Design a protein around this ligand. Structure first.
Ligand SMILES: CC/C(=C(\c1ccc(O)cc1)c1ccc(OCCN(C)C)cc1)c1ccccc1
Ligand SMILES: CC/C(=C(\c1ccc(O)cc1)c1ccc(OCCN(C)C)cc1)c1ccccc1
Ligand SMILES: CC/C(=C(\c1ccc(O)cc1)c1ccc(OCCN(C)C)cc1)c1ccccc1
Ligand SMILES: CC/C(=C(\c1ccc(O)cc1)c1ccc(OCCN(C)C)cc1)c1ccccc1
Lengths: 227, 223
């Protein structure tokens, strides 16, 4: 119960942060291939990392394996983009994928189409920047993205605890009540923009085949044999 | 003010659009023909609705268009979820056009889209979403679809109005905070459904103007 209390949860997420991933640009001037290559290599590394991070969130380990895989599968692009926005929050106009990989808007034009994605990331980052998004609020929101990715007893509980944690953090700020409700709303409403950039990103990534298993999974869940 | 805004959103509600099913057993075509007929009629009314929203008509004609342009599919799906809320397992497109999850199989693909809607509606049903709450959430979907002075002002006012609505409930503060988070967290699912629907709708050619639109804004000549 307590390991899931505002200060406890905040503490655990504070130290669950994945390790920073390093990567440096290539020799020649960026092309569409080299560009994506770097970002893919980079995205894959952080993903292996995103697993051990999820495992450290109070109780994630007790959710069925199917649900673990489900949430991570449904929310991984949003989690990446939020990690990316967060670390690019104090450097307006630039996306800090990694220390030696600090690309500004224009360089994205190396990979046809990513431009609109870069602007979405850049514009959402700005919103968090005006809000003066704090590291503690950030940690709660990232985890919330993980648990709010799809839609039980445990799941919802785990999610509401992360929610209670964020109210708590915003609460130790001193601002009145009406401004605590406002910040909560503003912060959460940016979740639509994150999800949206994720969908846009997925679509673009996909552009650059398996057997449909949607019905079968329902059948399986319905029969109750899924994991 | 909160009470004012609510009252104004209430009476700003679009009329209910009446449409009926066709003769023969729904075909992928006929099915999508009925939904498209319905949506366009609703979209027509949507403009009028957005115009009644306090302050909207003051935003440059460009922002108005941009907002409606980017949020219309969510607004629609939000309206659909609201009227299907008391009909589990069903999507109430109109009084005469109600479809079960299974009938959606008339149009190849929309099934996953129908499950997204029914499940979100399911979530709102479990939160016992209230009419006034719904009113605020809708305008909120319209006003938060894109990313100024008046804009944010307008958006924070509806947001104030929502907190206010949740406040006359009487639940403790911790619970009021909880409900605001749970409702707004549900926006991400609404936006997600919308993106999925757009992808599918699109599946069933113009010149890229994105870069040109930026320049035009940079040069400050856009509307
Ligand atoms: C938004 C930049 C980005 C990726 C990214 C975002 C944040 C971050 O911290 C690191 C990378 C990106 C690039 C590739 C990618 O594919 C990996 C394939 N794996 C899952 C096998 C995922 C995200 C991207 C997504 C779609 C198209 C083009 C670029
Ligand atoms: C590429 C998406 C994905 C998984 C996936 C890929 C294809 C598919 O058909 C279904 C899922 C994924 C998600 C979770 C996972 O967990 C292993 C079990 N627990 C103990 C971590 C493995 C792959 C994932 C990988 C790393 C981080 C976040 C998400
Ligand atoms: C969710 C069902 C739906 C539509 C809908 C939602 C709510 C509502 O109240 C009425 C209809 C839908 C159908 C067609 C559509 O395109 C119309 C073309 N216009 C833009 C000229 C938009 C939404 C739909 C969306 C994508 C693919 C197939 C069906
Ligand atoms: C189809 C999307 C759209 C508009 C649109 C289409 C293509 C494009 O390149 C840009 C926009 C749209 C939105 C608003 C609008 O309003 C007119 C200005 N005042 C009277 C509000 C006209 C078209 C729309 C129309 C009705 C309801 C909701 C959305």
């Amino acid at each position: 119960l307590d390991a899931l209390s505002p200060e406890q949860l905040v503490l655990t997420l504070l130290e669950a942060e994945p390790p920073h991933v390093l990567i440096s640009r290539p020799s020649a001037p960026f092309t569409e291939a080299s560009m994506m290559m770097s970002l893919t290599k980079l995205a894959d590394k952080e993903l292996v990392h995103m697993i051990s991070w999820a495992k450290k969130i109070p109780g994630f380990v007790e959710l069925s394996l199917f649900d673990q895989v489900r949430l991570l599968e449904s929310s991984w692009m949003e989690v990446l983009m939020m990690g990316l926005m967060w670390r690019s929050i104090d450097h307006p106009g630039k996306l800090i994928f990694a220390p030696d990989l600090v690309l500004d808007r224009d360089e994205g034009k190396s990979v046809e189409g990513i431009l609109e994605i870069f602007d979405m990331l850049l514009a959402t980052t700005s919103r968090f920047r005006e809000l003066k998004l704090q590291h503690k609020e950030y940690l709660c929101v990232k985890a919330m993205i993980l648990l709010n990715s799809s839609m039980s007893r445990k799941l919802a509980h785990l999610l509401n605890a992360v929610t209670d944690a964020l109210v708590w953090v915003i609460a130790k700020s001193g601002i009145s009540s009406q401004q605590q409700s406002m910040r909560l709303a503003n912060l959460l409403m940016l979740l639509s923009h994150v999800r949206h950039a994720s969908n846009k990103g997925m679509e673009h990534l996909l552009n650059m085949n398996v057997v449909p298993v949607y019905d079968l999974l329902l059948e399986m869940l319905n029969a109750h044999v899924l994991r």
